[PDB]
Amino acid sequence: ANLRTQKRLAASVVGVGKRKVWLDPNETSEIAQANSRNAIRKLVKNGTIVKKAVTVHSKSRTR
Amino acid sequence: ARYGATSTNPAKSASARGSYLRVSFKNTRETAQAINGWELTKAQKYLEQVLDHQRAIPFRRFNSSIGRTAQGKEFGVTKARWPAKSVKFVQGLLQNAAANAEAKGLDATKLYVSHIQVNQAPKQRRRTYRAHGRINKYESSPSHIELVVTEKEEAVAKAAEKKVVRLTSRQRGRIAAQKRIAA
Amino acid sequence: SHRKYEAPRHGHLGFLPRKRAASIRARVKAFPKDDRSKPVALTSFLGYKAGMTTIVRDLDRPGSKFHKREVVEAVTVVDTPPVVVVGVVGYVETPRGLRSLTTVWAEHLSDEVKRRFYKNWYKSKKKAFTKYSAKYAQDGAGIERELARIKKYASVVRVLVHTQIRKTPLAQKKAHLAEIQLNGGSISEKVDWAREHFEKTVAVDSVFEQNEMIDAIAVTKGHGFEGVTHRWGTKKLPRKTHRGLRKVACIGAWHPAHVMWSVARAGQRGYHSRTSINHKIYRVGKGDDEANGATSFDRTKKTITPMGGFVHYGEIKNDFIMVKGCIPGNRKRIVTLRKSLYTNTSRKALEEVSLKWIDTASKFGKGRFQTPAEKHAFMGTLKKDL
Amino acid sequence: LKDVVTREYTINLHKRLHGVSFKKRAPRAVKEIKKFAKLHMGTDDVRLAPELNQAIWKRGVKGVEYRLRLRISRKRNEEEDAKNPLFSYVEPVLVASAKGLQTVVVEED
RNA sequence: GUGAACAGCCUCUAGUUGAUAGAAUAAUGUAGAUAAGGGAAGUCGGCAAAAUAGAUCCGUAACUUCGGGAUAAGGAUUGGC
RNA sequence: CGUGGAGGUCAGUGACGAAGCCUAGACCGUAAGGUCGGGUCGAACGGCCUCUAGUGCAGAUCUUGGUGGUAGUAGCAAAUAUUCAAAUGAGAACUUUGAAGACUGAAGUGGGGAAAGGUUCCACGUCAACAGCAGUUGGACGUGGGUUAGUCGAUCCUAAGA
RNA sequence: GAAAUUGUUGAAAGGGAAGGGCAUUUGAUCAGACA
Ligand SMILES: [Mg+2]
Ligand SMILES: [Mg+2]
Ligand SMILES: [Mg+2]
Ligand SMILES: [Mg+2]
Ligand SMILES: [Mg+2]
Ligand SMILES: [Mg+2]
Ligand SMILES: [Mg+2]
Ligand SMILES: [Mg+2]
Ligand SMILES: [Mg+2]
Ligand SMILES: [Mg+2]
Ligand SMILES: [Mg+2]
Ligand SMILES: [Mg+2]
Ligand SMILES: [Mg+2]
Ligand SMILES: [Mg+2]
Ligand SMILES: [Mg+2]
Ligand SMILES: [Mg+2]
Ligand SMILES: [Mg+2]
Ligand SMILES: [Mg+2]
Ligand SMILES: [Mg+2]
Ligand SMILES: [Mg+2]
Ligand SMILES: [Mg+2]
Ligand SMILES: [Mg+2]
Ligand SMILES: [Mg+2]
Ligand SMILES: [Mg+2]
Ligand SMILES: [Mg+2]
Ligand SMILES: [Mg+2]
Ligand SMILES: [Mg+2]
Ligand SMILES: [Mg+2]
Ligand SMILES: [Mg+2]
Ligand SMILES: [Mg+2]
Ligand SMILES: [Mg+2]
Ligand SMILES: [Mg+2]
Ligand SMILES: [Mg+2]
Ligand SMILES: [Mg+2]
Ligand SMILES: [Mg+2]
Ligand SMILES: [Mg+2]
Ligand SMILES: [Mg+2]
Ligand SMILES: [Mg+2]
Ligand SMILES: [Mg+2]
Ligand SMILES: [Mg+2]
Ligand SMILES: [Mg+2]
Ligand SMILES: [Mg+2]
Ligand SMILES: [Mg+2]
Ligand SMILES: [Mg+2]
Ligand SMILES: [Mg+2]
Ligand SMILES: [Mg+2]
Ligand SMILES: [Mg+2]
Ligand SMILES: [Mg+2]
Ligand SMILES: [Mg+2]
Ligand SMILES: [Mg+2]
Ligand SMILES: [Mg+2]
Ligand SMILES: [Mg+2]
Ligand SMILES: [Mg+2]
Ligand SMILES: [Mg+2]
Ligand SMILES: [Mg+2]
Ligand SMILES: [Mg+2]
Ligand SMILES: [Mg+2]
Ligand SMILES: [Mg+2]
Ligand SMILES: [Mg+2]
Ligand SMILES: [Mg+2]
Ligand SMILES: [Mg+2]
Ligand SMILES: [Mg+2]
Ligand SMILES: [Mg+2]
Ligand SMILES: [Mg+2]
Ligand SMILES: [Mg+2]
Ligand SMILES: [Mg+2]
Ligand SMILES: [Mg+2]
Ligand SMILES: [Mg+2]
Ligand SMILES: [Mg+2]
Ligand SMILES: [Mg+2]
């Protein structure tokens, strides 16, 4: 398997860098089928691809 | 076919080869000689070990500035190595030879490796870049491997000439009297 | 052309070749000259280098600015449990040199020696000396004739002793066997002594005594493959020099067109056999003795084992030889201590020391305390303790 | 035979990593453990829980803790039959302090 | 963010984690450091290396085209709350 | 003495094996060389008299091609760094995914363009060569798909100049 | 389907090169001639 394309596509659809799309290992067969943006799209919204939160750079110690 | 010189009984033998193999010709030479003549089953167990770095292959010709290792005391040599890619090609052939003897109906228990010869396949040119804008050859030196397995067999019995004894008048005369005299 | 300036060479050619020794047990190449009037005894001993400490003592050198003053001096300690006698070997004179003609062995033989005759003790059937031992059976016949033969011929007698390595902190288990010449009177009395001592045991204090000058024979510590600068004490080359500087610049003139035996080259360093002479015995320690490290002037009961124990060695529970200064070999290595080959009058030898205080402070750091007693004394009570 | 056991050991990584080049410490730790595992279970097959992995790398390459308290579990191999029927699994145990525990056996159920 | 700062050093977003690999750590190296007492005696030559350094305040010679020389030289001070 | 070609001749040898090549087998010659046997081979070839010349190699730092010892040797060490597990696959240090440890630190290892390249873009398939280890991966290989303008550029203008 | 150069098998020799000349021992191999 090879979710290279689905990763990039995931990044683009969600509007976020590839360093933040998460493709869950348990639904790898389902994911690799997803060849289009429309199929990545419902994969995102049913929790198979999630958007992975930002890394915090808190201003607290600054303040 | 037409292998190199064999002396074995083809009726009792089986064989295999691989040509144009891309393995080191020098390395696999040494490992082929390492096994030459062996009980086929001892050979298999032996190359296996080699891959565990448990016993080694004694390097005997192609070997200057090789390292030394206690694993060659076995064979009286100090330089010995563990040439993986050679072993694995060579056991490939050995396993194929095995099959064919199964297929021929030879006894798998009497099987020793009776011919094992490697020589040099056509080379493979690739190039590399040297200082001041020069090129140099950078070659693969690949191998043909061929081996033959035979069922061992005991004895040989006798049978030969008879020695046509010729001895002159005074030479057959002594003998006549060597019994006319004695026993 | 000619050196331009003269300087002595670098290193001594009486120590070539500078290769690793044939064995960890350096060899006695020489025994003391035999005076057959004296009683029979050994002329060397076997021990293990334990380590070093400090000593304080009044010096007695009339003439010296330190006459009747204290000095502090360094000392080594070799762990020295009794050696055990297991065989006699009789040599004879031939125009080809000395040759052994028999070796008579004791009936029983400690495992520690039986150890030595092997490379794989555990797997082995341990048959070493099992037929030989049967020679005793019958009356005595066989061994008498041998003993007898030694007596008849034999220009020198040596004793086969071995060490009691199990009485020693080491892990080694496999003891050390060696020959020791016998210089008490008369070839015959010698073998009688040897025979009398089979399986029996010999003590240090019957070979060495206080203030004796003795020699140390041992294999020098090892350093493996060495550069020319540290191996020969050659000059460092200047910092500007291409392709490195711990070297020698000229390895030789153009003629002889050969590198010569006499120039420094890289190579092995250490693990050489050495024979040090003139090490004075400052103490002959007894193992069954507290107050080992105590003195006439100290008093305070304590052994010579430093707080926390000899670094890298262990404890010392057996007799020891305390020799002034240092010694070829390193901690844990077998050392042979030999009797002197000449009777030094020196003054320096002859001086009869008697220690005043023996350092016993820990050697694992900047030791501050001689004894736990002293440490509790000074420190007071701690969060562990009572 | 085989034996299938689980124990919980503590391993002194500190003296094992003593000397090791900073950029190699966490990776030695991984390997070192593996070795530690084989030495106790006899077993050439040694798998490390991705949590034990986290535990090891918890403080960057060169900041391995001095002592870890692992849980070594010798299990039987399944599928495609490897050379040996047995392997080991290593897990981080959830202890406050890896200091001062003796080596114990986890009872099996 | 620190700081005079588009400096250096750490971070967010994004992007990478590509550079044959394993085991050892001999000599000699390449690159990075330290060294008692002395302090250029080394050397063609102080080559290399070390020392100095920011800021605030005090203090500043010859000579000069009066513009400089000048951060001359030489000093003190500096965190946290 | 030997070679390529020519006139004559032996009504010469030959697919029942010409020529060539191999052979510490035989024989003739002082020698250049000649002759034969055996093996290999497959379509042509030789003796004698004469004619003829691009006619004989060990060398020329000779020409072209092929091959060695060197040698499994020098080496594959700049750019801080990797790790655990799963999945896949004949095969996984190197592919994919998840986890972790880091890096570039916006004067970027980010996001785009100009010149130049020209399909490298993208999908699917895929490992013989190629990516100085590997390879299931690729800017490689096979097969396809993809570049939409009244407003963006060109096109018009003029500059040095032609 | 030569040669350089290589693998294997068989035979032999090898105390700091090898190869060469005259001569013979020993091994291997062979022609001719007898009648
Ligand atoms: Mg072929
Ligand atoms: Mg060679
Ligand atoms: Mg060779
Ligand atoms: Mg080597
Ligand atoms: Mg080398
Ligand atoms: Mg060599
Ligand atoms: Mg050898
Ligand atoms: Mg290059
Ligand atoms: Mg160039
Ligand atoms: Mg007679
Ligand atoms: Mg002179
Ligand atoms: Mg030796
Ligand atoms: Mg005898
Ligand atoms: Mg050194
Ligand atoms: Mg010196
Ligand atoms: Mg010294
Ligand atoms: Mg020098
Ligand atoms: Mg230079
Ligand atoms: Mg260190
Ligand atoms: Mg990029
Ligand atoms: Mg590189
Ligand atoms: Mg200094
Ligand atoms: Mg000074
Ligand atoms: Mg000077
Ligand atoms: Mg001065
Ligand atoms: Mg000078
Ligand atoms: Mg000058
Ligand atoms: Mg000068
Ligand atoms: Mg400078
Ligand atoms: Mg300083
Ligand atoms: Mg001036
Ligand atoms: Mg000035
Ligand atoms: Mg203040
Ligand atoms: Mg002619
Ligand atoms: Mg002609
Ligand atoms: Mg012509
Ligand atoms: Mg020939
Ligand atoms: Mg003939
Ligand atoms: Mg023929
Ligand atoms: Mg023919
Ligand atoms: Mg034809
Ligand atoms: Mg003519
Ligand atoms: Mg010509
Ligand atoms: Mg010529
Ligand atoms: Mg030629
Ligand atoms: Mg030539
Ligand atoms: Mg010539
Ligand atoms: Mg030529
Ligand atoms: Mg190779
Ligand atoms: Mg190499
Ligand atoms: Mg390099
Ligand atoms: Mg390396
Ligand atoms: Mg790098
Ligand atoms: Mg990698
Ligand atoms: Mg950073
Ligand atoms: Mg910057
Ligand atoms: Mg890059
Ligand atoms: Mg672009
Ligand atoms: Mg291009
Ligand atoms: Mg692409
Ligand atoms: Mg391939
Ligand atoms: Mg490429
Ligand atoms: Mg490659
Ligand atoms: Mg490959
Ligand atoms: Mg394509
Ligand atoms: Mg296309
Ligand atoms: Mg417009
Ligand atoms: Mg237009
Ligand atoms: Mg052909
Ligand atoms: Mg001859």
From Swiss-Prot, chain A:
TM spans (from-to): none
Protein keywords: Cytoplasm, Isopeptide bond, Phosphoprotein, Ribonucleoprotein, Ribosomal protein, Ubl conjugation
Residues recorded as bearing Phosphoserine in the entry: 29, 36
GO biological process, one term: cytoplasmic translation
GO MF assignments: RNA binding; structural constituent of ribosome
Cross-link Glycyl lysine isopeptide (Lys-Gly) (interchain with G-Cter in ubiquitin) per UniProt, renumbered positions: 20, 52, 59
Subcellular location per the Swiss-Prot or TrEMBL entry: Cytoplasm
Family, similarity comment: Belongs to the eukaryotic ribosomal protein eL19 family.
Biological function: Component of the ribosome, a large ribonucleoprotein complex responsible for the synthesis of proteins in the cell. The small ribosomal subunit (SSU) binds messenger RNAs (mRNAs) and translates the encoded message by selecting cognate aminoacyl-transfer RNA (tRNA) molecules. The large subunit (LSU) contains the ribosomal catalytic site termed the peptidyl transferase center (PTC), which catalyzes the formation of peptide bonds, thereby polymerizing the amino acids delivered by tRNAs into a polypeptide chain.
Additional remark text: Present with 97700 molecules/cell in log phase SD medium. There are 2 genes for eL19 in yeast.
Name listed for the protein in its UniProt record: Large ribosomal subunit protein eL19A
Recorded name of the encoding gene: RPL19A
From Swiss-Prot, chain B:
Residues where Phosphothreonine is found: 69
Compartments in which it is found: Cytoplasm
Keywords: Cytoplasm, Isopeptide bond, Phosphoprotein, Ribonucleoprotein, Ribosomal protein, Ubl conjugation
GO molecular function: structural constituent of ribosome
Residues joined by cross-link Glycyl lysine isopeptide (Lys-Gly) (interchain with G-Cter in ubiquitin): 45
GO cellular component term, pick one: cytosolic large ribosomal subunit
Gene Ontology BP, a term: cytoplasmic translation
Domain of life, per lineage: Eukaryota
Subunit note: Component of the large ribosomal subunit (LSU). Mature yeast ribosomes consist of a small (40S) and a large (60S) subunit. The 40S small subunit contains 1 molecule of ribosomal RNA (18S rRNA) and 33 different proteins (encoded by 57 genes). The large 60S subunit contains 3 rRNA molecules (25S, 5.8S and 5S rRNA) and 46 different proteins (encoded by 81 genes). uL22 is associated with the polypeptide exit tunnel.
Function, in words: Component of the ribosome, a large ribonucleoprotein complex responsible for the synthesis of proteins in the cell. The small ribosomal subunit (SSU) binds messenger RNAs (mRNAs) and translates the encoded message by selecting cognate aminoacyl-transfer RNA (tRNA) molecules. The large subunit (LSU) contains the ribosomal catalytic site termed the peptidyl transferase center (PTC), which catalyzes the formation of peptide bonds, thereby polymerizing the amino acids delivered by tRNAs into a polypeptide chain.
NCBIfam families named in the record: uL22_arch_euk
Additional remarks: There are 2 genes for uL22 in yeast.
Family of the protein in this entry: Belongs to the universal ribosomal protein uL22 family.
From Swiss-Prot, chain C:
An example molecular function term from Gene Ontology annotations: structural constituent of ribosome
Family: Belongs to the universal ribosomal protein uL3 family.
Post-translational modification: Methylation at His-242 by HPM1 is required for proper 60S subunit assembly and promotes translational elongation fidelity.
Residues with PTM Pros-methylhistidine: 242
Keyword NAD in annotation: no
Effect of residue 242 to A: Cells accumulate 35S and 23S pre-rRNA precursors. Cells display defects in translation elongation resulting in decreased translational accuracy
Alphabetically ordered keywords of this record: Cytoplasm, Isopeptide bond, Methylation, Phosphoprotein, Ribonucleoprotein, Ribosomal protein, Ubl conjugation
Additional observations: Present with 450 molecules/cell in log phase SD medium.
Modified residues (Phosphoserine): 23, 155, 296
GO cellular component: cytoplasm; cytosol; cytosolic large ribosomal subunit
InterPro entries: L3_arc_euk, Ribosomal_L3_dom_3_arc_sf, Ribosomal_uL3, Ribosomal_uL3_CS, Transl_B-barrel_sf
Cross-link Glycyl lysine isopeptide (Lys-Gly) (interchain with G-Cter in ubiquitin), where in sequence: 38, 135
Modified residues (Phosphothreonine): 102
Organism: Saccharomyces cerevisiae (strain ATCC 204508 / S288c) (Baker's yeast)
Protein name (Swiss-Prot/TrEMBL): Large ribosomal subunit protein uL3
Subcellular locations according to the entry: Cytoplasm
Biological processes annotated in GO: cytoplasmic translation; maintenance of translational fidelity; ribosomal large subunit assembly; rRNA processing; translation; translational elongation
Traits of the deletion mutant: A mutant confers resistance to trichodermin, a trichotecene toxin produced by plant-pathogenic fungi.
Gene this protein is translated from: RPL3
Pfam families: Ribosomal_L3
Curated annotation (Swiss-Prot), chain D:
SUPFAM superfamilies from the UniProt entry: Ribosomal protein L31e
Miscellaneous notes: There are 2 genes for eL31 in yeast.
One Gene Ontology term, aspect cellular component: cytosolic large ribosomal subunit
Entry protein name: Large ribosomal subunit protein eL31A
Keyword vocabulary terms for this entry: Cytoplasm, Ribonucleoprotein, Ribosomal protein
Keyword Transport: no
Function in brief: Component of the ribosome, a large ribonucleoprotein complex responsible for the synthesis of proteins in the cell. The small ribosomal subunit (SSU) binds messenger RNAs (mRNAs) and translates the encoded message by selecting cognate aminoacyl-transfer RNA (tRNA) molecules. The large subunit (LSU) contains the ribosomal catalytic site termed the peptidyl transferase center (PTC), which catalyzes the formation of peptide bonds, thereby polymerizing the amino acids delivered by tRNAs into a polypeptide chain.
Annotated Pfam families: Ribosomal_L31e
InterPro entries assigned: Ribosomal_eL31, Ribosomal_eL31_CS, Ribosomal_eL31_dom_sf
